[PDB]
């Protein structure tokens, strides 16, 4: 058997099709079994329209061996484009076994696996082309977002979106997202997001009340500060050029949004700013974006 033929055949039973149908709509994607009780990780845009209109959409999981089972949304995170589904009382699930994306290196051979039975399903091959790659994602009413992504030249498309990025040990190192190089959500962020979605149905991320644009002191240029925000109270002014957030240099608006999410909620953090030719450090305490779940 081929080298990638073996790795793909060993993870196929862990990748499923995710189908969502209404009176006049249809959207399909892939998912991966991360827990033996029936927990499936997919990306948030695969299910977004079903989550927004659940009274009309029917969500279904289809396994490798043909079986078709209804599924429920446990939780979802548009900020990391992730979601958790649950199938009930299905036995002998081949659980995917999860790697460590911090141990991933540029040049590592990978496979972006889509659901073996999906309509337009794909399985592509490439290498890791970049790590911690901030990438913007923009198909429903959710927020646009940015993620620190694993970048690969394995093609990511409708057919393998939501399925796993797999290393040569048949371990999951990421979740493919199509929302011509590819991008995956690293598996360590997926464990954190999925771990907290399973228990609480929600995660909470820090927020500053800032929206930026990319700057020739380059960085993220403050376009608007929300009233009452942490940026408000910390001293951020509009047209500030943010160059550091916490311990992360900020090259543009994409890295800014990613850098904000790595911060601690309720702890003081320095924002280093280029203001009218000067450098100014400001202290900002991030609020939780979901204060009732915080």
XYZ file of C-alpha atoms in Angstrom:
294
model
C 0.000 0.000 0.000
C 1.112 3.551 -0.709
C 2.523 5.664 2.090
C -0.382 8.122 2.091
C -2.774 5.329 1.146
C -2.066 3.674 4.510
C -2.430 6.847 6.595
C -5.701 7.794 4.892
C -7.164 4.291 5.248
C -6.335 4.321 8.974
C -8.208 7.581 9.711
C -11.147 7.080 7.332
C -13.348 5.495 10.012
C -12.801 8.623 12.152
C -14.003 11.136 9.518
C -17.736 11.598 8.933
C -20.060 13.461 6.591
C -22.138 16.284 8.072
C -25.362 16.949 6.167
C -27.856 19.748 6.825
C -31.107 19.963 4.854
C -34.164 22.212 4.997
C -37.248 22.625 2.811
C -35.168 24.147 0.002
C -31.514 24.158 1.135
C -28.562 21.811 1.390
C -25.042 22.227 2.766
C -22.526 19.460 3.388
C -19.158 19.151 5.060
C -16.859 16.878 7.022
C -16.180 16.189 10.680
C -13.955 14.070 12.897
C -14.780 11.900 15.909
C -12.829 13.296 18.867
C -14.618 11.409 21.652
C -16.060 7.922 22.049
C -19.367 9.162 23.458
C -20.154 10.617 20.025
C -18.536 14.058 19.945
C -17.629 15.321 16.468
C -15.541 18.398 15.669
C -16.293 20.382 12.519
C -15.756 23.988 11.507
C -18.422 26.524 12.389
C -19.324 27.528 8.825
C -20.226 23.919 7.945
C -23.200 24.181 10.327
C -23.654 27.969 10.643
C -26.898 28.097 8.667
C -28.374 25.147 10.577
C -27.418 26.711 13.915
C -28.961 30.045 12.903
C -32.202 28.418 11.678
C -32.617 25.104 13.549
C -36.402 24.935 13.301
C -35.986 24.332 9.558
C -32.650 22.488 9.165
C -32.022 18.782 9.789
C -28.453 17.899 10.798
C -27.198 14.379 10.086
C -23.901 12.506 10.482
C -22.918 9.766 8.013
C -20.088 7.438 9.029
C -17.581 5.587 6.857
C -19.441 2.259 7.019
C -22.632 3.835 5.611
C -24.642 4.436 8.789
C -26.728 7.616 9.004
C -27.535 9.063 12.439
C -29.111 12.351 13.621
C -26.806 14.802 15.372
C -27.162 17.711 17.790
C -25.154 20.911 18.101
C -23.346 21.001 21.440
C -21.661 24.346 20.799
C -19.938 26.456 18.192
C -17.265 29.195 18.025
C -17.330 31.506 14.886
C -14.203 33.212 16.265
C -12.127 30.035 15.727
C -14.595 28.657 13.104
C -15.184 25.498 15.123
C -18.186 23.499 16.270
C -19.018 20.346 18.222
C -21.791 17.916 17.299
C -23.076 14.918 19.253
C -24.424 11.559 18.101
C -26.259 9.516 20.723
C -25.721 5.898 21.771
C -23.621 4.766 18.799
C -21.101 2.054 19.664
C -17.614 1.097 18.462
C -16.749 4.597 17.278
C -13.220 4.828 15.887
C -12.104 7.910 17.799
C -9.479 10.077 16.175
C -6.386 10.374 18.354
C -5.068 13.896 18.597
C -1.549 15.220 18.057
C 0.307 18.315 19.243
C 0.327 21.172 16.726
C 3.159 22.812 18.686
C 5.342 19.887 17.547
C 4.529 20.570 13.868
C 7.301 21.916 11.630
C 7.400 23.534 8.201
C 7.948 20.812 5.617
C 6.026 18.109 7.492
C 4.015 15.959 5.100
C 0.259 16.106 5.704
C -3.075 14.847 4.407
C -6.245 16.962 4.387
C -8.933 14.291 4.688
C -12.576 14.754 3.760
C -15.513 12.517 4.611
C -15.099 9.212 2.704
C -18.782 9.202 1.646
C -19.344 12.926 1.066
C -20.748 14.069 -2.260
C -17.763 16.132 -3.468
C -15.333 14.791 -0.871
C -11.572 15.128 -1.345
C -8.322 13.897 0.213
C -5.284 16.033 -0.629
C -1.552 15.829 0.067
C 1.013 18.488 0.844
C 3.436 19.850 3.412
C 3.144 22.390 6.199
C 4.031 25.702 4.552
C 3.690 28.099 7.504
C 2.832 27.957 11.222
C 0.926 30.627 13.251
C -0.322 32.104 9.926
C -3.074 34.729 10.808
C -5.737 34.207 8.128
C -9.090 35.986 7.617
C -12.256 33.938 7.114
C -15.523 35.235 5.660
C -21.544 31.381 4.819
C -24.173 32.766 7.183
C -24.896 35.551 9.651
C -21.778 35.002 11.778
C -18.895 37.349 12.470
C -15.956 37.413 10.127
C -12.838 36.336 11.994
C -9.115 35.538 11.875
C -7.216 32.512 13.206
C -3.628 31.524 13.822
C -3.655 28.801 11.183
C -1.491 25.958 10.000
C -0.841 26.746 6.342
C -0.376 23.918 3.850
C -0.078 23.475 0.105
C -2.424 20.515 0.378
C -5.597 21.799 -1.252
C -8.411 22.666 1.166
C -11.856 22.819 -0.410
C -15.548 22.123 0.138
C -14.747 18.409 0.006
C -12.301 18.229 2.920
C -13.410 21.285 4.915
C -14.171 20.451 8.535
C -12.133 17.253 8.308
C -8.725 16.649 9.855
C -5.283 17.753 8.802
C -3.359 14.537 9.440
C 0.360 14.056 10.025
C 2.355 11.013 8.922
C 1.566 9.289 12.245
C -2.162 9.341 11.356
C -2.582 11.974 14.088
C -4.842 15.008 13.837
C -2.799 18.222 13.840
C -5.580 20.523 12.665
C -9.060 20.984 11.249
C -9.368 21.939 7.589
C -11.360 25.104 6.914
C -12.330 26.370 3.463
C -14.124 29.403 4.912
C -4.157 28.231 -3.608
C -2.681 27.216 -0.264
C -4.803 25.711 2.470
C -5.451 26.663 6.063
C -6.225 24.536 9.107
C -7.161 25.319 12.699
C -4.338 23.958 14.908
C -5.288 20.973 17.036
C -4.184 22.543 20.327
C -6.601 25.487 19.850
C -9.259 22.927 18.774
C -8.856 20.909 22.044
C -9.268 24.081 24.160
C -12.236 25.332 22.134
C -13.846 21.886 21.925
C -13.171 21.077 25.589
C -15.051 24.197 26.699
C -17.819 23.869 24.098
C -18.590 20.324 25.272
C -19.136 21.340 28.905
C -20.549 24.874 28.741
C -21.981 25.068 25.218
C -19.890 28.216 24.740
C -16.432 29.715 25.075
C -15.501 33.212 26.173
C -12.821 35.266 24.404
C -11.232 38.570 25.463
C -12.213 41.780 23.712
C -10.970 45.367 23.697
C -13.615 47.276 21.733
C -11.152 48.009 18.911
C -11.521 47.663 15.151
C -8.358 48.194 13.118
C -7.026 48.556 9.598
C -3.593 47.513 8.357
C -0.957 50.231 7.951
C 4.703 52.047 5.451
C 5.700 52.223 12.206
C 3.562 49.590 10.502
C 0.830 47.684 12.303
C -2.907 47.854 12.929
C -4.430 51.339 12.724
C -7.294 51.946 15.166
C -10.339 52.807 13.055
C -12.883 52.944 15.895
C -12.970 52.601 19.679
C -16.249 51.471 21.211
C -17.560 53.501 24.128
C -17.054 52.066 27.603
C -14.596 49.543 26.149
C -11.240 48.520 27.625
C -9.574 50.542 24.855
C -11.781 53.415 26.033
C -10.658 53.215 29.641
C -7.052 52.242 28.873
C -6.303 55.304 26.750
C -6.431 54.031 23.157
C -7.133 56.796 20.645
C -8.329 56.418 17.078
C -5.641 56.473 14.357
C -3.290 54.881 16.890
C -0.999 52.335 15.236
C -0.864 49.251 17.458
C 2.469 47.450 17.109
C 2.467 45.207 20.188
C -0.406 43.521 21.983
C 0.689 41.775 25.166
C 3.743 39.733 24.201
C 2.896 39.546 20.475
C 4.111 41.941 17.803
C 1.243 43.060 15.564
C 2.050 43.393 11.861
C -1.467 44.228 10.621
C -5.149 44.070 11.551
C -5.241 40.287 11.072
C -2.530 39.615 13.657
C -4.181 42.155 15.973
C -7.434 40.186 16.229
C -5.451 36.992 16.812
C -3.240 38.713 19.394
C -6.260 39.954 21.363
C -7.589 36.410 21.792
C -4.311 35.183 23.329
C -4.697 37.694 26.170
C -6.021 37.098 29.674
C -9.468 38.350 30.637
C -9.419 40.761 33.564
C -5.611 41.035 33.667
C -3.722 44.179 32.704
C -1.858 44.024 29.393
C 0.353 46.541 27.567
C -0.631 47.938 24.164
C 2.343 49.583 22.467
C 1.180 52.323 20.119
C 2.673 54.692 17.552
C 0.850 57.966 18.280
C 1.684 61.061 16.182
C 5.236 59.844 15.581
C 5.781 58.741 19.206
C 5.805 55.354 20.925
C 3.337 55.025 23.803
C 2.589 52.016 26.009
C -0.985 51.784 27.291
C -2.471 49.418 29.871
C -5.759 47.765 28.880
C -7.754 45.183 30.845
C -9.656 42.920 28.416
C -13.344 42.272 28.941
C -14.938 38.916 28.124
C -16.903 38.989 24.883
C -19.618 36.835 26.529
C -20.076 38.307 29.993
C -22.904 36.050 31.198
C -20.968 32.883 30.362
C -17.903 34.471 31.985
